[PDB]
């Protein structure tokens, strides 16, 4: 036998009928936990896989609103990198943002400039094709073109272009003559995003727009959702907070609403199976009268293991079954029919999430047992049948 009288009084209480029908219905609570975990580590794995592609595409195309000046430009001597102190910043770098037009020999295109530093770190560094990071010498003004701009212009290697600014124009007495300089091309970078279309690379030290100073120092935030809430931060004299054009401000709420709306819906399949424990223990209170009831706190603790017997086997079986289908959705032969996407499915299985999510399906089998077990001790013995 067993030295403890707790795991022996429930081994013969999970189906001892010699038939082909009544034996499988005793393990019906095992199916509700095995398929409950199977529908738990599958939807949450493909949801985090779709959210992982959002972080790879963000913070890699353009910065946001950082600094401004209501009195003209900003001088780097009066405001160094040690004076400004914000939260979430890790590294600063100079930047010059301004929309300029291009006078080519085939068509006309408009794009914004990027005054990067050749001696510092750039986010477009792994996307450099046939170009070096230290090629923007003061006096040469090298322009690096992309994919979508050269499709309608045809600017090859060794072509002189003409970039003009529409805003930075002196008020001449005879019309408005804008400022323009001579330029050249050195290569073509490829990133497969929006930066290849209307975003050019220029040197930080230039006299084509103003004067000599810079506009400010760009930064990278850890989360682009809390920019509107962190707009009430302190600002020194000579700066102004601008609108950050919240494309992912309220749209990120709509793509995370499915985690909170379907997540309450997906928390019900482990709650529907909680009523399966009560309908599997409501008939046990009338048969326990005769063995351990008519003939003190541990007497009612016999059903907490049998009420959680489907929670131990059904969790370690549904985890291997849920990981077999979530990791291979379109890898196996599709017997359902037409595949909608069928190409480049991203997965995301966190090791820190599978330990916490295995405790939710375990703790529900112990907390949903105390309420049927309360009707086995306080209730009178000889009142159910006789």
């Amino acid at each position: 036998y067993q030295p403890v009288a707790l795991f022996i009084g429930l081994r013969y209480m999970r189906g001892r009928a010699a038939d082909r029908f009544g034996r499988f219905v005793s393990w019906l609570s095992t199916i509700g936990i095995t398929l409950g975990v199977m529908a738990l580590v599958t939807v949450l794995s493909v949801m985090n896989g779709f959210e992982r592609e959002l972080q790879n595409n963000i913070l890699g195309l353009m910065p946001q609103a950082i600094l401004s000046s209501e009195h003209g430009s900003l001088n780097p001597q009066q405001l160094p990198e040690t004076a400004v102190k914000l939260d979430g910043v890790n590294r600063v770098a100079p930047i010059t943002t301004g929309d300029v037009v291009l006078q080519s020999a085939r068509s006309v295109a408009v794009g914004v400039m990027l005054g990067i530093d050749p001696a510092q770190k750039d986010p477009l560094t792994p996307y450099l094709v046939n170009v070096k990071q230290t090629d923007l010498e003061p006096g040469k003004y090298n322009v690096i073109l992309g994919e979508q701009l050269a499709s309608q212009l045809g600017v090859n290697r060794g072509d002189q272009i003409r970039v003009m600014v529409p805003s930075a124009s002196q008020f001449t007495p005879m019309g408005r003559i804008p400022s323009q300089r001579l330029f050249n091309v050195i290569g073509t970078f490829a990133a497969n995003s929006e930066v290849d279309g209307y975003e050019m690379l220029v040197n930080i030290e230039d006299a084509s727009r103003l004067m000599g100073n810079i506009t400010g120092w760009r930064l990278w935030l850890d989360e682009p959702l809390k920019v509107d809430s962190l707009s009430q931060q302190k600002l020194p004299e000579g700066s102004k907070w601008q609108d950050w054009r919240d494309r992912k401000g309220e749209l990120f709420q709509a793509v995370r609403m499915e985690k909170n709306m379907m997540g309450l819906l997906l928390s019900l399949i482990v709650a529907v199976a909680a009523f399966n424990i009560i309908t599997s223990l409501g008939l046990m209170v009338m048969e326990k009268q005769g063995e351990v009831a008519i003939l003190p706190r541990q007497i009612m603790m016999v059903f907490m293991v049998q009420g959680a017997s489907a929670g131990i086997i059904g969790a370690i079986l549904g985890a291997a079954l849920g990981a077999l289908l979530a990791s291979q959705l379109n890898n196996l032969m599709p017997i359902i029919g037409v595949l909608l996407d069928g190409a480049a499915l991203p997965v995301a299985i966190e090791p820190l999430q599978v330990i916490v999510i295995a405790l939710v399906a375990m703790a529900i089998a112990l907390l949903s047992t105390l309420y049927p077990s309360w009707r086995a001790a306080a209730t009178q013995p000889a009142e159910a049948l006789r």
């Binding site: 082909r20 029908f21 009544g22 219905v25 019906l28 199916i31 509700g32 398929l35 529908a39 939807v43 493909v46 779709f50 592609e53 959002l54 595409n57 301004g98 929309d99 037009v101 085939r106 006309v108 295109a109 408009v110 914004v112 529409p166 805003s167 019309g175 408005r176 929006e194 609108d243 054009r245 494309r247 401000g249 749209l251 793509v255 995370r256 609403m257 499915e258 985690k259 909170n260 709306m261 379907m262 309450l264 819906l265 997906l266 019900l268 399949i269 709650a271 529907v272 199976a273 009523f275 399966n276 009560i278 309908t279 599997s280 409501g282 008939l283 359902i336 996407d341 916490v356 159910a384």
Partner: protein, 405 residues
């Protein structure tokens, strides 16, 4: 018209033997928990899919037919060739502009496009989102322009004031000319949410004909087909009557993640929102094995096998059909007027757990979609007939070794 299997089997469903009503409120609510939220999950996904085909797909055209950097002069004959084909209903030309704006010393990128005021409501739902009293005043002659609300959030402009919009000076000879300055006024604003509200602007077609100094020439031809998924194969077989060169470019690119989460999340609901009925259907089977003893049909008792199954398929309809008609009353009060209730979760727990690192904060969405209220009620009751058929097949040959008839 009371038959023989429904008239003499009504008194067997009602029972009263003590602790019955405490367990009778488990099966009818357990079958109702998967249907009352099924009308919420089908309305939340279709409510977000309705916004995809209204402010994203309905505002961007699909078919693009252009020339080799040249205004297509003979565009009247191009409308007669592809108009009545099986798959393309209507079409309307458009001319793109690459000018910039300068108002109030605020700089922002803009992609102004040319839409005809009489050829915009037959193939697109873009001017159908006006918040004013009427939108029929948008015409040509007085140089009107309707812009989005994203321009006014950065350029602080007002509806009714005059702004300055710069246009590129065109020239048939490749040289440098002076930039033109055209002063326009805002005669109404259009609202979008956060994405395309700061890059679009609509001018009439007759105003576009006077800016580039052309008589009867356009540049691009826009259209819209029936389906929304097949976009990489229907445009390629629709350019055999035009010239050999057209700008072929399907709408795929940086906005790829907004389409993957509307087609595969719907695909996994066939294994998640169908599985919630699959766990809830175990409740009606556990009461059948509970009632396999002391029942007319499993006891010793020239009819067919339908007399035994008549008491098994009717007990599932006593709680399954009553639960589906009860969950729809409490299911519509949470999908229309919802309130936050998740506030008391970490106050009375005794021992602190659930160490948070990064999560999301729930809020209240906004949707309105009510058409799948009767088709979802009929498919949630037919499988309960097969859910009681399988215990009814194994309820005919039982040896009475332990039970005495």
């Amino acid at each position: 018209p009371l038959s023989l299997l429904i008239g003499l089997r009504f008194s067997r469903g009602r029972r009263r033997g003590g602790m019955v009503s405490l367990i009778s409120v488990i099966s009818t609510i357990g079958i109702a928990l998967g249907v009352a939220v099924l009308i919420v999950g089908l309305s939340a996904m279709n409510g977000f899919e309705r916004e995809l085909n209204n402010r994203i797909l309905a505002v961007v055209p699909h078919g693009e037919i252009e020339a080799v950097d040249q205004p297509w002069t003979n565009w009247q004959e191009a409308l007669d060739h592809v108009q009545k084909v099986p798959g393309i209903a209507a079409a309307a030309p458009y001319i793109n502009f690459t000018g910039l704006v300068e108002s109030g010393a605020n700089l922002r990128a803009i992609q102004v496009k040319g839409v005809n005021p009489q050829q915009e409501q037959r193939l697109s739902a873009l001017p159908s989102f006006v918040q004013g009293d009427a939108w029929r005043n948008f015409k040509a002659g007085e140089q009107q322009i309707i812009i989005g609300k994203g321009v006014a959030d950065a350029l602080k402009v007002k509806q009714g004031d005059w702004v300055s919009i710069m246009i590129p000076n065109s020239n048939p000879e490749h040289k440098l000319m002076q930039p033109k300055r055209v002063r326009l006024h805002v005669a109404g604003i259009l609202q979008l949410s956060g994405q395309l509200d700061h890059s679009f602007a609509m001018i009439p077609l007759a105003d576009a004909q006077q800016y580039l100094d052309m008589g009867s020439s356009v540049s691009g031809i826009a259209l819209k087909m029936t389906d929304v998924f097949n976009a990489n194969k229907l445009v390629r077989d629709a350019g055999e009557v035009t010239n050999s060169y057209v700008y072929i470019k399907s709408w795929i690119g940086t906005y790829g993640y907004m389409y993957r989460d509307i087609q595969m999340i719907r695909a996994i609901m066939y294994l998640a929102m169908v599985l919630v009925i699959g766990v809830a259907c175990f409740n009606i089977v556990s009461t059948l094995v509970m009632a396999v003893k002391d029942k007319s049909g499993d006891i010793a008792v020239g009819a067919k096998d339908g007399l035994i199954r008549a008491i098994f398929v009717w007990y599932g309809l006593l709680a399954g059909l009553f639960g589906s008609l009860c969950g729809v009353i409490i299911g519509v009060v949470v999908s229309l007027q919802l309130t936050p209730i998740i506030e008391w979760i970490e106050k009375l727990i005794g021992h602190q757990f659930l160490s948070s690192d990064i999560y999301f904060i729930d809020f209240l969405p906004s949707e309105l979609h009510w058409l799948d209220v009767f088709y979802v009620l009929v498919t949630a009751l037919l499988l309960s007939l097969l859910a009681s058929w399988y215990p009814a097949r194994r309820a005919s040959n039982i040896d009475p070794a332990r039970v005495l008839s």
